[PDB]
Write a protein that binds this ligand. Sequence first.
Ligand SMILES: CC[C@@H](C)[C@@H]([C@H](CC(=O)N1CCC[C@H]1[C@H](OC)[C@H](C)C(=O)NCCc1ccccc1)OC)N(C)C(=O)[C@@H](NC(=O)[C@H](C(C)C)N(C)C)C(C)C
Ligand SMILES: Nc1nc2c(ncn2[C@@H]2O[C@H](COP(=O)(O)OP(=O)(O)OP(=O)(O)O)[C@@H](O)[C@H]2O)c(=O)[nH]1
Ligand SMILES: Nc1nc2c(ncn2[C@@H]2O[C@H](COP(=O)(O)OP(=O)(O)OP(=O)(O)O)[C@@H](O)[C@H]2O)c(=O)[nH]1
Ligand SMILES: COc1cc2c(c(OC)c1OC)-c1ccc(OC)c(=O)cc1[C@@H](NC(C)=O)CC2
Ligand SMILES: COc1cc2c(c(OC)c1OC)-c1ccc(OC)c(=O)cc1[C@@H](NC(C)=O)CC2
Ligand SMILES: Nc1nc2c(ncn2[C@@H]2O[C@H](COP(=O)(O)OP(=O)(O)O)[C@@H](O)[C@H]2O)c(=O)[nH]1
Ligand SMILES: Nc1nc2c(ncn2[C@@H]2O[C@H](COP(=O)(O)OP(=O)(O)O)[C@@H](O)[C@H]2O)c(=O)[nH]1
Ligand SMILES: [Mg+2]
Ligand SMILES: [Mg+2]
Lengths: 421, 427, 124, 419, 419
Amino acid sequence: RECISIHVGQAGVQIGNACWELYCLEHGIQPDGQMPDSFNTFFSETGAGKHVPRAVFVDLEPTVIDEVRTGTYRQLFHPEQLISGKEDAANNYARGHYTIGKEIIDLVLDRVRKLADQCTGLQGFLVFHSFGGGTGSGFTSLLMERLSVDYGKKSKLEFSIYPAPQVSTAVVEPYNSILTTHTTLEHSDCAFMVDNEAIYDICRRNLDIERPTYTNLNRLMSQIVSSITASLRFDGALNVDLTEFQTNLVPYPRIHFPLATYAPVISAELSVAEITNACFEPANQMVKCDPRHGKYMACCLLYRGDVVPKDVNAAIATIKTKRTIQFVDWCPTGFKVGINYQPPTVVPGGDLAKVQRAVCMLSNTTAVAEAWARLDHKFDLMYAKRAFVHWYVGEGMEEGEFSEAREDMAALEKDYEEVGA
Amino acid sequence: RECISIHVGQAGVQIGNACWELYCLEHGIQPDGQMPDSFNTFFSETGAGKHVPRAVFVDLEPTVIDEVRTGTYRQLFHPEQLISGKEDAANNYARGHYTIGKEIIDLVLDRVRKLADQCTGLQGFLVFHSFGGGTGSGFTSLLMERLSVDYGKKSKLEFSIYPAPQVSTAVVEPYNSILTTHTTLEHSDCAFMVDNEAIYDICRRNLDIERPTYTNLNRLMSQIVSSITASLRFDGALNVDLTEFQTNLVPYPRIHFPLATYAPVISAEKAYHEQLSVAEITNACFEPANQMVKCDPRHGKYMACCLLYRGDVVPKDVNAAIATIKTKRTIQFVDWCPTGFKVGINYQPPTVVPGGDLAKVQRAVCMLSNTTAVAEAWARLDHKFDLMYAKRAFVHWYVGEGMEEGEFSEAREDMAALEKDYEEVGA
Amino acid sequence: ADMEVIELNKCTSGQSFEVILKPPSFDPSLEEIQKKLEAAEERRKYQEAELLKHLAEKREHEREVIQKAIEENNNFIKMAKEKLAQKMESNKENREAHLAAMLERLQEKDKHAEEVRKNKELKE
Amino acid sequence: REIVHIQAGQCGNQIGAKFWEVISDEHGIDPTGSYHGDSDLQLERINVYYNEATGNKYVPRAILVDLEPGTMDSVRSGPFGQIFRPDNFVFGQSGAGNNWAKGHYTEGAELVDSVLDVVRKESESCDCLQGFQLTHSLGGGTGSGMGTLLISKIREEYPDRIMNTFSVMPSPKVSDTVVEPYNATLSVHQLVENTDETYSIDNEALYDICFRTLKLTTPTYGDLNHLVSATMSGVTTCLRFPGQLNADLRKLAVNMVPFPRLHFFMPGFAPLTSLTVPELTQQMFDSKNMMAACDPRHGRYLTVAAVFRGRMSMKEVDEQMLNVQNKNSSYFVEWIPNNVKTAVCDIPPRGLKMSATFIGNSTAIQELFKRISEQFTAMFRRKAFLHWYTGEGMDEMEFTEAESNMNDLVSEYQQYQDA
Amino acid sequence: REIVHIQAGQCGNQIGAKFWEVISDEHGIDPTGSYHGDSDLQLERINVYYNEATGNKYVPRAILVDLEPGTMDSVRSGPFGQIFRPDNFVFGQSGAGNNWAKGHYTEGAELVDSVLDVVRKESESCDCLQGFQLTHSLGGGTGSGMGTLLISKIREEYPDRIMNTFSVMPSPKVSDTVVEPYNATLSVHQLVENTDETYSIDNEALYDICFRTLKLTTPTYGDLNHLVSATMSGVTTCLRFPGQLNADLRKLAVNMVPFPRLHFFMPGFAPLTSLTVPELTQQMFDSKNMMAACDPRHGRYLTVAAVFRGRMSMKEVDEQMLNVQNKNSSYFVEWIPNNVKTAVCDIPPRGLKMSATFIGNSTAIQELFKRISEQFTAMFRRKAFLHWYTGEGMDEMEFTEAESNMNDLVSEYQQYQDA
Ligand SMILES: CC[C@@H](C)[C@@H]([C@H](CC(=O)N1CCC[C@H]1[C@H](OC)[C@H](C)C(=O)NCCc1ccccc1)OC)N(C)C(=O)[C@@H](NC(=O)[C@H](C(C)C)N(C)C)C(C)C
Ligand SMILES: Nc1nc2c(ncn2[C@@H]2O[C@H](COP(=O)(O)OP(=O)(O)OP(=O)(O)O)[C@@H](O)[C@H]2O)c(=O)[nH]1
Ligand SMILES: Nc1nc2c(ncn2[C@@H]2O[C@H](COP(=O)(O)OP(=O)(O)OP(=O)(O)O)[C@@H](O)[C@H]2O)c(=O)[nH]1
Ligand SMILES: COc1cc2c(c(OC)c1OC)-c1ccc(OC)c(=O)cc1[C@@H](NC(C)=O)CC2
Ligand SMILES: COc1cc2c(c(OC)c1OC)-c1ccc(OC)c(=O)cc1[C@@H](NC(C)=O)CC2
Ligand SMILES: Nc1nc2c(ncn2[C@@H]2O[C@H](COP(=O)(O)OP(=O)(O)O)[C@@H](O)[C@H]2O)c(=O)[nH]1
Ligand SMILES: Nc1nc2c(ncn2[C@@H]2O[C@H](COP(=O)(O)OP(=O)(O)O)[C@@H](O)[C@H]2O)c(=O)[nH]1
Ligand SMILES: [Mg+2]
Ligand SMILES: [Mg+2]
């Protein structure tokens, strides 16, 4: 009933930056923060006229955060909610969690404390961060440690960008990923992975954008992010509420990692059923993998726009009887379906067209640990020669922290496979 | 020579309510209690003007007793003689005899004591109560225990409504019946059962009333009840006092259960037909069809008979009636008995309720019989009990209020004994 | 039927009489228990002083499992504050006299660099 | 003689809002105002559901309980929204969870008192209070959780008095939520112990009823909610009107339950939707017509009760009932003698110049319980989402106590098909 | 985020004069004046190399060190001679020697302070200084000697910050001495210890590049110097322009060096002298094209980075690169997963509407080091000219420590051709 976004580090920021852009257009707030449902979930009607996001932005180098207080939306945020740290984390987790985090962590934590100080029953956090990458792995990890202390119950939802070869990574990446995951894990309640590769693959194919920008990919994620949070922003008597959407998505306290298929992505310039039917689609996934391989344990469709349950149930029926079903051993075969009457608003300049209705399929499938391995294998064979390890042992880390994380990784990789039959 | 009615619980009450209504009409008392033989048997000529019944009324839920101090007759009774107890017995004997009885028993007993305090030689009690049903089984049973202490000799006559499937009962019913009967028995001197079903069957048939009210049935019983007590309101030989009842109906101290047949029951609008012959009324006394407890004595054996004629009648005929049943029906008396027939003639003509469904008659008989086939009725109750109890049925609902698993035992015990005594008086 | 009628009681406003028709043929209370009235009363105050301190039971298990929860969140807090004090210190210690481990490279190639321009002072 | 009424949470509250919108109608009460009805009877027993107030005015005996404002602000606006004492409202402000623990223990207890404190003032201010009845979802959190408790809390502050519940036992079809099996299993154990009569309203039956026979293609939480509403009507009735029996409701209880194990009644209705009398019986006694998803067949009846409504003679009613039990002899128990009772009342409902409603204590209900104790061990099996409650501060084996009790119950139901 | 720049001595200085003459061009700065360029980007990162001054005006972040007036007065006159802050000049006045000792010890130290005192004022007057880069001869004296020291002195006054060097590793084919082997071997030991990344510019390669392919007859210190100049350009670039990555240069470092042993990169260029893109890659990845005289073949790559210049689409760039590694699979290490990264920038250099530059951490460089540690023991197999440094105040075995260290390094490069 009050809901704070934290975006940390290049990705975290840029992803967010361009989906508060979408939130605003959705709720019809003009850049300067003014505007002529309830959506108070995400904004404070501060003073008379203006609206201000319920957000903090933290990067350890200006640049990104900087071109925020540069590019219209200059106004949106209060001067203090964007934190910035003079010196980069240099693509390495040691720095973020320890060396240069130490510095800015205590200020950050005070400013989130300030936006919650002003919420009669805050209920959570939407942490936005990269998987590899200095400050995204590191600071996040540090942040979430501390937050768990100051706000024990209060949910932490992480949105994670699992990285890929061709939306550019960097050698050491894999280390950082394996690294944060492990720490973050026993502190984060539920986590939405986003395969950059998948996203990038959607653009190249469905939009025709040959070599996509960050901002290119970022719009797509924006839409996906909205369509999740959509729930707790406004109402619409038909559903909404992530609170108890999670309920299904995480059967098992290991922070599980839902997979976001999204409805129609079609370039500017379809039947209730058809959109659905593209949710059960490798091609249209949002982490590279596949569930003709893995088993489901939690399913959940998030429809947006003008839709009718009549139409929604008879498309759900014949989804159970001509396709690959895939529900593990011991579950209801669920399908928590949520409709939000409010039609899917999109960015005018952008590459996608106005739709009429858009699905959103959240799935907890076992084959998402296809994605955990491809990360692990990289790690294992680099580490197999200390790779770059020293760059971390330097900033103050341990030879055995790297061990005792990959430790954990191999355990989770099994749990997932261990929910077999 | 002074005679107190106690009516306990729904049935008890309503039955009474509507037959003091007839007593009044009979003795010509206006509702407010004023009037312009002796009948002091049943009223006290209190203060100047008014008459008041010699009655108490006890229910554990208002409602019934309430609509008494509501519906003209409002006046008849003194404020205090109607006792009412906030909380229902809920259809179970446990509550009546123990749990909720305990509360109101000590007050009741004091108010009967009061109507007797003012009787120079009270002679008895006319207890009116249901067979199944919460307070009707339970309170009664508690009452009659206590009365037997405070008033040792003094007769207790019970009028009991043996219940039936279709004048509505309730599962547990059979429990309660069997239950009270056992306790009540070694305390009550003589008892007139009244088969609800029998009564209901009389209406459906003789009155054409398709689906009868309580009030519909109750009137009938009213008539019958009068026609018994008749004796001891007007004085003129046989059941003059209460003692005379034992003498005449019970051969065998086991509280026996006389069966009332009643004379002509004929729907008004017939009123003006040829009134029936002294003989004919008699002849319908010996009539399954006209019984007042479902059973039959072409099956059982008599041991005490007794005709109660009302109206202008003459012995000479009463006789030559009796005469051609002796050689027209099933005589049928027990190995070691005369073939009795104490006849009671009362000159006073049978008065009836104007609104009512029956017509003014000219004479009406009343046949009280002690027959062994009344234990037909004891069995039909027992069988129910036995087969419910065969799985503890509802028993807990009583064990709860404080009863014993073995009180249920040691009552059905008694029941199987009586059921034999009755069959054990057969040649 | 053939009757014979015994006379018994002719009276102001009624008559009685028998009509014997054929010869026959051949041949405490205790005030006591209002005490058992007290027996029921007894075994119900028990009946209920059961479900009572049996439901006073089914509470403060309640009050217990409430606490075995907050009492298990405090475990998670002062278990994982020191997963951080003994890390954000097993660190700033692991480096703060460990970057100065990089200065025994320097005050060494320095107290030798001075040390052999003291060799040049070996041309006097 | 007098009864206060509890509504708890999303389903418990909407169920009642459409319960009060009907009885208030049949008595004739404006949104606020008192009487307006060309009948007269009504006000005999208006006592039983209406502690009346200032001016003439009628305010229902109603305690409104929920753990999120939501569905409660949904009633203050809408139906007879004005009608309930605005101080008889208890908001939760926090989450419900949809998790039985939060409802019965943590976020629950938290409120309890301030509803306990209100049932008190309302009951302790009746005049010969007879009992409580309460409505609720049986899976899901607030209703099911806080409820079970509230009634477990009511007992004790009232031993003595009897416990009445309408419980919507939840199904796979119409609402997912990987959990209810848990919440329900947990509550079913809980009912079995605390209450005297409960009415199993199976949502599965309810929506299968709008479909297999009704062709309502996409059933509202409304219609279906409207079904229960009218079944609530006729189940009461002699409670709230008549001149036949008088119904202590304890008089009910003590007659419809041979075995202490509060046996759960399956209800069912006469003319369905939104009438010869024969044709009104063979409908009421048909399985396609029961509010609990069981075919009373595999399972005989213990005790049955039916109450009829409107202008029709108890001539055909007597002998249509005393018929059903012959063209179906062996499906009512042998050893409970007159175990099917009918009652006649002649003041019509919604539309309808004719309507029967039916209450059956049938071992066919074993069927309904088994199946949830099976969605249960199909999860509590590999200790499924259990973690949502391990974490709430509950023990692992406190689930095994209620599976191991619900199975005990199913077993009695079974045992009783005897000699 | 900010970087000050050191130039030391004859080669170190001339290299920079033609480094600044190119970057100053691409941003658009007169000899003195500020801007003049019909582009716009430029001034984003002009920050990084230009501590700006009075009026508008742009003055480079530049420390100029030499131990004889000579080559410094050669810059004040000539190119963008005016541009450097005249107090950023440190003259030596005495001999250089062309001997590493004089530079690192006696005639060196002498000055160090008055350049250490300047790097301070310029760095300590940046605002989030990122690191230093310095240029120098690796054989010869002042550049190589005073350099090694200056950086050995910079570390310590700055631990923390990272160390960047362009080093001209000197050759038999085209050099002005016989001693360099000494100076270089002494310095190579010295770098391996102090810096984070170094660029080996082999003069052998440089002149062999003007000959084996160019036919450039008698090569000036002019051209050949011009090559390094434009290679310095494209090696920075993302440091000084873009909108792609952002490049902490520590971000570079930490990604290009698996092993602490500051592994020395070998550079190389696209279109050479004084362009299809395929033909731009196979040029950039060809051994005849590397600024360090090695054939990357006998020697696999650890990590590689390439930055492209001019408007051309990253469609063919993506897949031309992700090509080279297949038509040459086994020559990039197996165990460093994505160890070849490309960056695209679209603002042209000197002429050229197309230009790639390439940075490779290859054990092929082992080849370059072995050969100098061999000119060495072909002379330290003699205490040959050693007497120039014995005499300067140095010990005999302080050469053996650096032969014995230069051999250790060559041994790691070797060891890593593993599993
Ligand atoms: C099982 C719920 C069902 C009854 C309705 C839906 C939900 C609903 O509550 N509605 C419809 C619009 C408004 C509301 C009611 O209409 C009269 C009404 C206002 C009401 O009584 N509401 C309850 C109060 C409330 C208000 C505000 C917030 C929460 C609750 O009712 C139509 N619904 C969306 C579904 O059934 C959906 N079910 C499914 O998709 C499937 C099932 C049925 C197989 N999922 C479980 C996978 C649809 C697709 C058939
Ligand atoms: N989808 C998407 N991915 C990004 C974006 N920026 C970085 N990434 C990815 O995240 C990883 C790099 O993390 P960064 O956030 O850039 O590193 P950081 O330390 O958090 O940020 P910096 O301090 O600026 O270096 C790589 O896998 C990139 O592919 C972005 O804007 N969108
Ligand atoms: N003839 C007749 N029978 C009645 C009447 N009222 C109840 N009965 C019967 O008596 C039995 C029920 O007993 P009740 O007197 O109603 O029960 P109670 O506990 O005595 O009275 P309540 O406290 O009002 O419950 C059933 O078998 C009914 O058929 C009546 O008015 N007339
Ligand atoms: C001047 O700024 C540069 C800075 C960096 C890189 C680089 O080479 C292309 C630069 O250009 C010379 C860089 C390097 C190397 C890597 O190793 C392959 C890597 O993964 C990654 C990179 C760069 N990152 C990306 C995503 O390409 C970050 C560091
Ligand atoms: C609301 O008030 C009701 C109250 C009762 C009964 C009932 O069902 C018709 C009610 O209607 C729902 C009732 C029930 C059941 C019996 O079991 C078959 C019984 O014998 C007897 C009854 C009722 N009694 C009679 C004589 O019909 C008494 C209790
Ligand atoms: N029939 C009926 N059932 C409902 C309703 N609302 C919820 N339910 C059922 O009960 C379950 C959850 O109940 P809910 O009311 O949300 O629990 P609460 O949060 O405690 O109030 C669902 O699975 C449904 O099957 C209602 O409107 N009517
Ligand atoms: N490419 C390049 N190399 C040079 C230049 N000047 C000197 N060198 C190389 O470095 C060695 C000596 O460098 P030098 O600059 O004279 O040393 P300094 O006295 O310390 O400045 C020579 O052997 C050359 O190979 C230059 O102008 N350009
Ligand atoms: Mg970073
Ligand atoms: Mg009763």
